[PDB]
């Protein structure tokens, strides 16, 4: 199985594989065996989960052999593994969502201490690997705090998280 990452709010694409090319019946179930989407002839059935007004699928790709899973407004609690169901098979996938923000919005004076707030899901081991325009690739645990924050250390810092050889980039709003 593969693993992807979420960016706390955007959409994610989770595809299945089918080589029959007949528009056969598919399903979408989690590890707790809860229906979310499923084929009904040529129709779409939003299954009884906590992702009713969030899950989507591209119907035009159904006569090809690719069945996506578009989930908008990704939360932290939505991190779970999903299995596919085509031609009596179980294509297991994985999904992880996390987030990162600050607490001080605009009052970041020259020489004021910096605080971060990492929102990582339970049951996972992230690793903070940031990147600064001044060449500060500060690595550590989950919570990172820097005493130095001046006018020359503003800008959208690229903090990425390496876990299971996967990483996504983010930005940091700094107002000095």
């Amino acid at each position: 199985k593969k693993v992807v990452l979420g960016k706390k709010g955007d959409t994610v694409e989770l595809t299945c594989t089918a080589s029959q090319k007949k528009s056969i019946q598919f399903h979408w179930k989690n590890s707790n065996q809860i229906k979310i989407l499923g084929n009904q002839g040529s129709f779409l059935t939003k299954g009884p989960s906590k992702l009713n007004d969030r899950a989507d699928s591209r119907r035009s790709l159904w006569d090809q052999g690719n069945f996506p899973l578009i989930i908008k407004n990704l939360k932290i609690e939505d991190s779970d593994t999903y299995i596919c169901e085509v031609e009596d098979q179980k294509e297991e996938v994985q999904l992880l969502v996390f987030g990162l923000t600050a607490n001080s919005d605009t009052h970041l004076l020259q020489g004021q201490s910096l605080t971060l707030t990492l929102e990582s899901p339970p049951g996972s081991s992230p690793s903070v690997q940031c990147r600064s325009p001044r060449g500060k690739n500060i690595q550590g645990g989950k919570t990172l705090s820097v005493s130095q924050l001046e006018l020359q250390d503003s800008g959208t810092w690229t903090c990425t998280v390496l876990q299971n050889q996967k990483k996504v980039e983010f930005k940091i709003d700094i107002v000095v």
């Binding site: 009904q40 129709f43 059935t45 939003k46 009884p48 009713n52």
Partner: peptide
Amino acid sequence: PPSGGDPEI
């Protein structure tokens, strides 16, 4: 009642 989806379902 059903869990939502298409109006034909």
